Design a protein around this ligand. Structure first.
Ligand code: DHE
Ligand code: DHE
Ligand code: HEM
Ligand code: HEM
Lengths: 542, 532
C-alpha cells in the first residue's frame, strides 16, 4: 500500500470539534494529519472512505468512540491493521493524536485542474531552440535511466561501459522513467505529481519542460501507435483521482479526465479511484489506463480530444500493474488484492478473460514473455504474498487449448517477489524476492532455464545468484530489485537497494554465463531502485 | 442522518440533533435552487467561504425576507419559524453535508416487477387506437391520464410517481415509461386489457429524463433515465426495468477543465443512426453518446460542447442533435452519425428553451429548426440542411417576435402549415393564456416580422379563475389537431383544449374532475417516432 508523503507535507487548519468530541490545536492536528497521509491513507484512503482498510469517516468513528480507536491503533488486528502502538512505530502520544484526529472532520485535500497545472507548467527550452539531430555521441538506445529514490535524482548510465554519464535533479523521488516512441524524450514522473521531460539529443541532456499534474502520482506513458510517435504523453494520479493527456513536445496539458465513478461489480459510487499502471496500445491510437478501486480499464483514443472516444472495460477491483504479451496485442494485468489476472484484447477493445493465479498478490511489473518449450507462448508473473511463479498461455490462434489458462505454477526463492524478467535473446527467467524478510533471500535472485522446462507437473529447478554478496555489501539489509536487460539482451542489471546513508550498488550479470560481470558503485548512487534501458522501454520488449 | 461538522472560530456549533434538523430542511427545500452541494445553480452559491464573509445577520435576513431575484421569503411567509430560520442561518456557516448516494443496491431494493414478461399479453388485448392515445401528466395528483385522441375520452387514470415530468414510448409503441421528479420510474404495458404498471424502480432523489432505445434492431431493448441527484444515468432492461449499468456524470467542465461535483443530467434523446443514447450533462457542458451494444466494454464519446445544456431535439432527418445551452444563449449542434460537434451558434435571444423544437421547411431558407425563448419574445430559426442548403446550414437565418417573453414550447407537424408558440411564463394573464400561430407558407425571410394569429386558448376553455397558463402544443397522430394544456392550480379549474389545425378554430374542450394540473401531453405515435 502507498505512502502519500507529498500530501502529508500539506499544512491544514484544524477543524472545530462537534458534539462529544475534543478539539485539537492547529499544531496537534497538523502533526496527526502528516502521520495519516504518510502511514494510513494508503489503506484507508485520502478521504477516509476506505480501500484496503475500512472507512474511517466521522459518521462511523464517532459511533465507535475514542477508546475503541485508541486500542485498535495501538494493538492492530490480524485482518491487516498494523500494531502502531505496541510495535513502537507510533508513540503513545501519537496514538492518542490519531484517535482524536479520526473523530474530527476529514481534511479535504485540494483539487488540481487546468488552472493549477498551467501555473506549474514551465518550458525551459522551446521546441524551436532544441537540436535538430543528436548532438552528443552517446549510444542512446543502450542508455539506462536509474531512479535514485531518496535523492530525488536519476542517473543516466552507459549500457556498455557502465559510465555514469550524468546525474540529474528532479526535486523529488521519481517512480519511473518512460521513453517516447522515437527514443528522443525521456519522461520521469515524481511521486509528487511532478513531470520532467528530458531531451536526450542535447550535448548535455537536461529538462526542457516540467509540469505538475496532481499531489500524488506514480505513472506515465507515451504514445506508441505507429504514426503517433512523440505526439502525446499521459500521466495518472492517486490524488486527485484523474489522468492527464499532455503535448508530447511541450508538456502542455490538453485533457484532464476524472476517474471517480462506480465500482464495476457493486456499481456503488467510489470517490477516490487511483490511477495505477498506464500502457500504450500498438494496435490503436489509445492509452490503456488501469483504475484501481473501481476495477475498470480505460482505452482512451487520443486522435480527437474534443470528441473523446473511450472504452470503459469492467475488469476486477484492485488493478495495479501489467504488460502486453509477446505480440503486443493483449494486455495482461494483475488485480492484486484479488489474486486475479485480467486479459484485455487491445485490437478489439474487449475483456477476454479473468483467471486466478493460485498465488497470493500477483505483482508482475510488466511481466515476462517467452516461448515455453511445450506450452508455446506464455506470460509470467511472480507474487508478493508467496513464492509462486505462474504462467498464462498467450497464443489463442496457435495454441488455442492453452490460451488464457494458468498452465503451470512453481516456486522460486521465496515470498516478497516484485519483478520477473527475461528477454527474447535470453533463455533465462530472473525472479527477485525484494521484500523477503530473510536477508539471504532478499539479497538474491532465482534463475530458471526456459529451455529445460517441460511442464510435466514437476517443479523446474533454479540457480540462485547472490547479487548482494557479489556487490560486496553486507551493511544494513540490502534488497535486490528488478532485473532489466541491455539493448542486446546479453547482460541483465539488478539494483542492490540499501538505505539512504548506506552503500548501494548496481550489479551487471552476463546473461550467457550467469556470472558476475561488473559492479557499479559511486557516492552519488543513493538508493537505486527502478532502472530502464531506453531501447527495451520504448519498444516494450519484455 | 449525517455527522455534524465542527464549527470554526467565530462560527457557532450546532448539536448533532440541530444539524440533522437543518440538513433535512435544506435538502428538501433549498437543494433544488442552491445545489445539493451548495455550489449554487438556480440560486447563489452558499458555500462556507462565501457565507462566512456575509455573516450571521446577513444570512438570517435573506432567509426571512427574501428578494425579487428569486430567493423566497421563508420567514415572513411562515414557511420557517424563527428558530428554524436561525438554525438555517447557522447551518449555512457550517461545512456542507455530504448528500446520500443511490447506487445499484438501492435501485434493486426499489425494483419491483409486477407482471413478469412471460405473463404479459402476446398481442394487444384492448381495442384502443394506441397510436392516437395521449399520455397526460396530472402534475400535483401524482397520476397520468391516458386520453383517446379522437373521442377525447379519458380511457384511464393511473397512479405514478409525484409530478411526472415526461412520458416516453418504446420504439414499438407498446411500453409507456414515465418518470416522476422524485426519481420514480413506472413502466406501463399498453397491450393489456386494462393497461397498468408492470414494473417500477427508483433511480435517484431528483430526476427529469427518460428515453427508450430507438435504433432499428434495438426496439424494446433498453430504457435510460437521468438524475439531477445523484449525478448519474442508468441503463435499464427495456422489459423489466432491471438496472444494468450506472454511470456517474461527475467530472471536469469542458472549458476550464476544473472538477465539478454536481453535473446534472438534463435532456436524453436516442440516436436513429447508431445504437446510442444521447445524454446532456448540464454543468460540465458535455454531451455523451453512449453505445448500448455492449454494457461490459462500454464505448462512449464525450463531446465538449457548451455549459448549461438543457433541452433539445433532432432535426427532420433525425441525424443532427440541436440543443440549448440555455444560460449562455447558444445552440449546440451534434452530428449523431459521425459522433462529433458541428457548430455552436448564439440565437440573439435570452434563454433559448425549445423543448424538442420544431422542424419545418421554410419557403425561402429550406429545412430549419426553431426555438422560442424564456427570456424574451423572439423565435429563432437555424438551417438544418448541409446537403441541399449549404450556405444556410447551422446559421441563425431569422429572428422575430411572438406573443411575449416566458415562452416554453414551439410546435409544428409535417402535415401542418402552422407554427404554434406559447408564452406560459408571461406575467400578463392575457398573454400566458394565449398562443401565437405563424403561417409557415407566408414566411418570406425578407427581414420583416411575420405576422401571427393569437388564439385565446384559456378564454376558449371558459376559465378566468386564477391565472391559467397555457403550455405545450402536441399534435395527434395525423397532425390534424393540436392539444394545449390550460394549467391552473390544484384546487382551481384546469382543462385541455383541442384546436383544429386546418381552420385554427376550437374543436373541443376537455374538462373532468380528475383532470388536475394538466401539464405535459405526449401523443404515442409522435413520441415513439420523434415526429416534431
Ligand atoms: C502504479 C505503479 C506502477 C506502475 C507504473 C506505470 O505503469 O507506469 C509502479 C511501477 C514500478 C516500477 C516499474 C517497473 C517496470 O519495469 O515497469 C518500479 C521499478 C517500481 C518501484 C517501486 N515501487 Fe512502484 N509503487 C506503487 C505504484 C506503482 N508502481 C505504489 O503505490 C507502491 C506499492 C507504494 C508507494 O508508496 O509508492 C509502490 C512502491 C514501490 C517501491 O517501493 C519500489 C520497489 C521502489 C521505489 O522506487 O519506490 N514501481
Ligand atoms: C431536463 C428537463 C427536460 C428534458 C427531459 C427529457 O429530455 O427527457 C424537461 C422537459 C419538459 C417537458 C417536455 C416536453 C417535450 O415536449 O419534450 C415538459 C412538458 C416539461 C414540463 C415542465 N418543466 Fe421541465 N423542467 C426542468 C427540467 C427538464 N424539463 C427543470 O429543471 C425545471 C426548469 C425546474 C423544475 O423544477 O423541474 C423544469 C420545469 C418544468 C415546469 O415547470 C413544467 C412546465 C411543468 C411540470 O410538469 O413540472 N419539462
Ligand atoms: C495509520 C497510523 C492508521 C490508522 C490511524 C488506522 C486506523 C484504523 C482504525 C481506527 C481501524 C478500525 C476501523 C473499524 O471500523 O474497526 C483500522 C482498521 C483497519 N486498518 Fe488501519 N489504520 C492505520 C494504518 C493502516 C494501514 C497502513 C493499513 C494497510 C496495510 C491498514 C489496514 C487496516 C485494515 C485492513 C483494517 C480492517 C479491520 C481489521 O480487522 O483489521 N491500516 N485502522
Ligand atoms: C432553503 C430553506 C433556503 C435557504 C436557507 C436559502 C438561503 C439563501 C441565502 C442566505 C441567500 C443569499 C445568497 C447570497 O450570496 O447573497 C439566498 C439567495 C438566493 N436564493 Fe435561496 N435559500 C433557500 C431556498 C431557495 C429556493 C427554494 C430557491 C429557488 C426558488 C432559492 C433561490 C435563491 C436565489 C435566486 C438567490 C440569489 C440572490 C437573489 O437576490 O435572489 N433559494 N438564498
Amino acid at each position: 500500500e502507498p505512502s502519500l508523503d507529498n500530501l502529508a507535507q500539506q499544512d491544514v487548519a484544524a477543524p472545530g470539534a462537534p458534539e462529544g468530541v475534543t478539539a485539537l490545536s492547529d499544531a496537534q492536528y497538523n502533526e496527526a494529519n502528516k502521520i495519516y497521509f504518510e502511514r494510513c491513507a494508503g489503506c484507508h484512503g485520502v478521504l477516509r472512505k476506505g480501500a484496503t482498510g475500512k472507512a474511517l469517516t466521522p459518521d462511523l468513528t464517532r459511533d465507535l468512540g475514542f477508546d475503541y480507536l485508541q486500542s485498535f491503533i495501538t494493538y492492530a488486528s490480524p485482518a491487516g491493521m498494523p500494531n502502531w502502538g505496541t510495535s513502537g512505530e507510533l508513540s503513545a502520544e501519537q496514538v492518542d493524536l490519531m484517535a482524536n484526529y479520526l473523530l474530527l472532520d476529514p481534511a479535504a485535500p485540494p483539487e488540481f485542474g487546468m488552472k493549477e497545472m498551467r501555473e506549474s507548467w514551465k518550458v525551459h527550452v522551446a521546441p524551436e531552440d532544441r537540436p535538430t539531430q543528436q548532438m552528443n555521441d552517446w549510444d542512446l538506445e543502450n542508455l539506462f535511466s536509474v531512479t535514485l529514490r531518496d535523492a530525488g535524482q536519476i542517473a543516466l548510465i552507459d549500457g556498455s561501459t557502465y559510465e555514469i554519464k550524468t546525474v540529474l535533479d528532479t526535486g523529488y523521488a521519481v517512480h519511473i522513467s518512460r521513453l517516447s516512441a522515437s527514443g528522443r524524450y525521456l519522461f520521469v514522473i515524481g511521486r509528487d505529481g511532478k513531470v520532467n521531460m528530458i531531451d536526450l539529443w542535447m550535448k548535455e541532456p537536461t529538462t526542457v519542460a516540467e509540469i505538475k499534474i496532481g499531489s500524488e502520482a506514480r505513472s506515465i506513458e507515451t504514445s506508441k501507435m505507429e504514426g503517433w510517435e512523440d505526439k502525446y504523453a499521459i500521466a495518472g494520479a492517486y490524488w486527485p483521482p484523474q489522468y492527464v493527456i499532455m503535448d508530447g513536445e511541450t508538456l502542455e496539458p490538453k485533457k484532464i479526465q476524472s476517474t471517480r465513478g462506480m465500482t464495476y461489480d457493486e456499481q456503488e459510487y467510489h470517490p477516490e479511484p487511483r490511477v495505477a499502471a498506464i500502457l500504450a496500445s500498438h494496435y490503436r491510437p489509445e492509452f490503456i489506463v488501469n483504475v484501481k478501486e473501481t476495477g475498470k480499464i480505460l482505452l482512451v483514443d487520443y486522435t480527437d480530444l474534443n470528441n473523446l472516444k473511450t472504452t470503459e472495460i469492467s475488469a476486477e477491483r484492485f488493478l495495479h500493474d501489467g504488460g502486453l504479451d509477446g505480440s503486443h496485442r493483449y494486455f495482461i494485468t494483475a488485480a492484486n488484492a484479488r489474486n486475479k489476472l485480467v486479459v484485455i484484447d487491445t485490437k478489439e477493445g474487449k475483456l477476454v478473460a479473468i483467471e486466478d493465479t493460485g498465488g497470493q498478490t500477483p505483482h508482475p511489473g510488466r511481466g515476462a514473455n517467452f516461448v515455453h518449450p511445450t506450452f508455446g507462448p506464455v506470460w509470467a508473473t511472480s507474487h508478493m504474498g508467496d513464492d509462486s511463479v505462474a504462467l498464462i498461455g498467450t497464443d489463442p490462434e496457435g495454441h488455442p487449448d492453452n490460451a488464457w489458462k494458468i498452465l503451470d505454477s512453481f516456486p522460486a526463492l521465496g515470498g516478497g517477489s516484485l519483478f520477473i524478467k527475461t528477454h527474447p535473446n535470453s533463455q533465462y527467467l530472473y525472479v527477485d524476492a525484494t521484500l523477503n524478510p530473510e536477508a539471504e533471500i532478499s539479497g538474491s535472485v532465482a534463475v530458471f532455464d526456459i529451455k529445460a522446462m517441460t511442464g510435466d507437473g514437476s517443479d523446474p529447478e533454479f540457480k540462485t545468484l547472490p547479487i548482494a554478496e557479489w556487490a560486496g555489501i553486507t551493511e544494513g539489509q540490502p534488497r535486490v530489485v528488478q532485473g532489466e536487460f541491455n539493448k542486446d539482451g546479453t547482460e541483465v542489471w539488478f539494483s542492490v537497494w540499501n538505505g539512504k546513508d548506506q552503500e548501494s550498488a548496481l550489479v551487471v550479470v552476463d546473461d550467457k554465463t550467469l556470472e558476475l560481470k561488473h559492479v557499479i558503485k559511486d557516492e552519488r548512487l543513493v538508493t537505486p531502485t527502478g532502472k530502464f534501458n531506453v531501447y527495451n522501454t520504448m519498444t516494450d520488449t519484455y
